[PDB]
């Protein structure tokens, strides 16, 4: 509440856009409310787009910036999850995020990079290549690194909207290991 | 390998059909391989259909049965997850599963009921009503109850195919709690 207004731009994918949530339930809205509750005179613009890849973010970063009433004081950069989820090459997410950060650096807008994590079913080579993007870029650009901020959703499954669980091949094997003894016993009796 | 052949019918949804898996990677195929490895002369027919509700299962249970070369010795019944995931009424999943089990009882085919669990984001009233279906029906029909056989997928996230995580409203709040201190600190410096 006290002081001049601080403009924060939340630039991201569904985790900022608020997929199947009301606008005032989305991360940018709730973050703003918590900042102001702590006494900061902060306005957070929601520029999340569900489905955005790093490539889609790069295609629109300049237009989003030039559309605001003034240059934002701070950008929250949160992209890459959709790259990883669609199996796009980790090096291409790195390339696009690097260039997004270049355009922000060229305008002297400071950035907080929201780190993302590869889904653990994917290859270890992919996982290393993807996960290292965010600390690597944060160092190169002297951005703050916000770590894996959907970590509480991994701890607490009741915080995530319901969806289908589809096992991998190895997940089916664990399902069999879990049930084969009981099925074997039933078959033994008839 | 030794003895006369035992015919098991796997009647279910994507968790039996093997969504985005090869047929020989699906639960019915791998269960068969593990049973035979333990010395049982068992053939498991995959009658999983991805997307099947309890209602869809009921509409096709008689045709699946009458299509086999003889009457199956054992049915694995695994439905309800899609009901719960689509927000269909728990009482309607109970009604359809009851009737499926009636048709099997009327043919004297013994059944193992695969219990399902409501996603923890859903209401506690829904969760109670849905989760109680499977032990309740198993008692009424003297079916074996296989408990929550995708339990290992909840333990080990690397066993499940990757997909989007969409927070609830309360999940967004946990995300804010996770990040507000660091964002507050960054804003305090500029
Ligand atoms: Ca509402
Ligand atoms: Ca300003
Ligand atoms: Ca500038
Ligand atoms: Ca293959
Ligand atoms: Ca037989
Ligand atoms: Ca019969």
Residue numbers in the entry:
A (entry chain A), B (entry chain A): 16 to 205
Quoted passage from the original study:
The results showed that both CrmE10 and AlinE4 belong to the SGNH-hydrolase superfamily and the bacterial lipolytic enzyme GDSL family. Among these four residues, Ser and His serve as catalytic residues, and Ser, Gly, and Asn serve as oxyanion hole residues.
According to sequence alignment, the catalytic triad of CrmE10 consisted of Ser29, Asp178, and His181, and it was composed of Ser13, Asp162, and His165 in AlnE4. Mutants CrmE10-S29A, CrmE10-D178A, and CrmE10-H181A had no enzymatic activities, which confirmed that these residues were crucial for the activity. However, the function of the Asp residue was barely investigated. The loop between 310-helix η3 and helix α9, on which the catalytic Asp residue was located, showed significant conformational change between the WT and mutant CrmE10 and had a higher B-factor. The higher B-factor of the loop implied flexibility in its structure and function. In addition, one key residue (Asp162 in AlinE4/Asp178 in CrmE10) was found to be able to stabilize the conformation of both esterases and the metal ion Cd2+ reduced enzymatic activity by blocking proton transfer and substrate binding.
